[PDB]
Ligand binder design. Structure first.
Ligand SMILES: Cc1cc2nc3c(=O)[nH]c(=O)nc-3n(C[C@H](O)[C@H](O)[C@H](O)COP(=O)(O)OP(=O)(O)OC[C@H]3O[C@@H](n4cnc5c(N)ncnc54)[C@H](O)[C@@H]3O)c2cc1C
Ligand SMILES: CCOc1cc2oc(=O)n(CCC(=O)O)c2cc1Cl
Ligand SMILES: CCOc1cc2oc(=O)n(CCC(=O)O)c2cc1Cl
Ligand SMILES: CCOc1cc2oc(=O)n(CCC(=O)O)c2cc1Cl
Ligand SMILES: [Cl-]
Length: 448
């Protein structure tokens, strides 16, 4: 039986642990945190993620989709909130088969842990990887107190997140060609209780957006009708705009309240614990990190956030990590040896990770910033109706299909260009020749 050591019992790590263990690999999974399935008296908080077709299909292959969806809230569309006008629902797809799912991250992680164990993987909690000795094939782990434990390894999988200790250890034996692109927005999580969301008629089956240009709020629903609100706002005000809003300007919860009352007036009354949430929840950091190399021979490989940290504006990080887990398990199971498997996995996934990193950055402007956008979406829906095998909106290709991200981006660019060309030199949708637009669709978009 082939052996594997996995670092990080997160989303990618647990899924790959289940896929390999059920194929008869001897799997040992090391996690820095305590086991979340061990109930304590700690007062934790609900953070949700949007599960889309790539993540759902990965869970489906693993036999866990039904269990995960049983506690997921359907999000049919984008509910855009602008003060003065009623909230506008922009459906994501053609029917209720084309939806995204709001899932509690802790619940998903617990289902995945149970799944990896049921398949035969051994999970070891309260052990954080500190260092790897590649030449001696040993690694060093420790608990929070720094008590060390050394282990031998044969194959090392770094599924240890955006601040990966496996990636740090690899970067010492090989130049990973790491390129970091910091993102100016920080993020803060705030809560809407079930009573408040019901009082203010906040739609549970939608992903909510309060656009505001350089900053915005989003809200994802929970099963109990509470919502997690995420504020995206610059850490610091730029030199050109010193008066522009930023986290640096919000000294306390009371300052955050004044900011919401002024900039998000329809949202502030729903946030009862705004002051406390603001002061007690830390401001998170965002970034895009691109690596030239994801593996060291046949000894170690990275996947998920460990391999490709991305900005969260497409809700695709977990979806991409679960898709990586499937690809990695497939390559490892069927290759001639581990070195061939790692080289083939990296060659396959690197162009796709780059495409989703680029599309995630582009989706920020789409969410936070229009009459022309709605006219291009209008013409795009007509083109999707006339040619459903050639014209598939980029959001639908990313979210509802398993088309490689790089192909979704490439086809998306052709579509963006033709929509922009047709909506140019025309005031209304009635002056645009639809048959002419349909002709460049047939000329430049091959069918799928
Ligand atoms: C604000 C925000 C919103 C998001 N929303 C979405 C969304 O809607 N949809 C979506 O698809 N994605 C979303 N994402 C992205 C998603 O959360 C991640 O891409 C995903 O969790 C990556 O899974 P992972 O398994 O690679 O890493 P993680 O889930 O981060 O798991 C890594 C694991 O490794 C452990 N670990 C870390 N260091 C060590 C160590 N040294 N030793 C041992 N264990 C270690 C951690 O404790 C953790 O359990 C969001 C991210 C953010 C920040
Ligand atoms: C067995 C591993 O379990 C987990 C790993 C995790 O990694 C994370 O970033 N979070 C989410 C953020 C946080 O709740 O602090 C998280 C939660 C769980 Cl249950
Ligand atoms: C904290 C959760 O954050 C997110 C989740 C998400 O899921 C998605 O599908 N998107 C895009 C939605 C759209 O463009 O309407 C998305 C964006 C963000 Cl910031
Ligand atoms: C990317 C290229 O896109 C196009 C090329 C085009 O050439 C044309 O003659 N038409 C129609 C002219 C018009 O009625 O505006 C046309 C339309 C589109 Cl979308
Ligand atoms: Cl994301």
């Amino acid at each position: 039986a082939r052996q594997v050591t996995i670092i990080g019992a997160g989303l990618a790590g647990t899924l790959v642990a289940r896929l390999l263990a059920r194929n008869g690999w001897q799997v040992n999974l090391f996690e820095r945190r305590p086991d979340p399935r061990i109930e304590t008296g700690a007062r934790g908080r609900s953070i949700n993620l949007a599960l889309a077709e790539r993540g759902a299909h990965a869970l489906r292959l693993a036999g866990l989709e039904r269990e995960v969806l049983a506690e997921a809230v359907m999000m049919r569309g984008r509910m855009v909130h602008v003060p003065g006008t009623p909230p506008n629902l922009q459906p994501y797809g053609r029917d209720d088969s084309e939806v995204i799912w709001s899932i509690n991250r802790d619940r998903l992680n617990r289902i995945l842990l149970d799944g990896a164990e049921a398949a035969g993987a051994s999970i070891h909690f309260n052990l954080g990887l500190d260092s790897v000795d590649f030449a001696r094939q040993r690694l060093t782990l420790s608990n929070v107190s720094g008590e060390r434990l050394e282990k031998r390894f044969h194959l090392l999988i770094g599924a240890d997140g955006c601040n990966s200790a496996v990636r740090q250890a690899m970067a010492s034996v090989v130049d990973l060609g790491e390129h970091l692109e910091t993102q100016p927005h920080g993020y803060k999580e705030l809560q809407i209780t079930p009573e408040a969301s019901a009082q203010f008629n906040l739609e549970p089956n939608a992903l909510h957006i309060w656009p505001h240009g350089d900053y915005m709020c989003i809200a994802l629903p929970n099963l109990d009708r509470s919502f997690t609100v995420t504020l995206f706002l610059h850490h610091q005000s730029p030199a050109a705009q010193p008066a522009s809003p930023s986290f640096a300007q919000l000294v306390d919860g009371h300052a955050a309240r004044r900011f919401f009352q002024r900039q998000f007036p329809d949202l502030s009354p729903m946030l009862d614990s705004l002051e406390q949430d603001f002061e007690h929840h830390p401001t998170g950091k965002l970034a895009t990190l691109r690596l030239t190399t994801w593996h060291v021979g046949g000894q170690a490989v990275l996947l998920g956030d460990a391999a490709h940290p991305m900005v969260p504006f497409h809700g695709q990080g977990m979806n991409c990590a679960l898709e990586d887990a499937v690809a990695l398990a497939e390559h490892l199971q069927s290759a001639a040896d581990n070195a061939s498997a790692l080289a083939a996995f990296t060659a396959q996934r690197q162009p796709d990770a780059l495409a989703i990193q680029a599309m995630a950055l582009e989706n920020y402007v789409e969410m936070s910033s229009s009459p022309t956008y709605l006219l291009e979406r209008e013409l795009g829906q007509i083109m999707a109706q006339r040619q459903p095998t050639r014209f598939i909106p980029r959001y639908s290709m990313v979210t509802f299909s398993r088309l490689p991200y790089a192909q979704a981006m490439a086809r998306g660019q052709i579509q963006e260009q033709l929509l922009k060309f047709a909506v140019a030199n025309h005031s209304d949708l009635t002056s645009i020749n639809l048959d002419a637009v349909e002709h460049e669709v047939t000329r430049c978009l091959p069918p799928l």
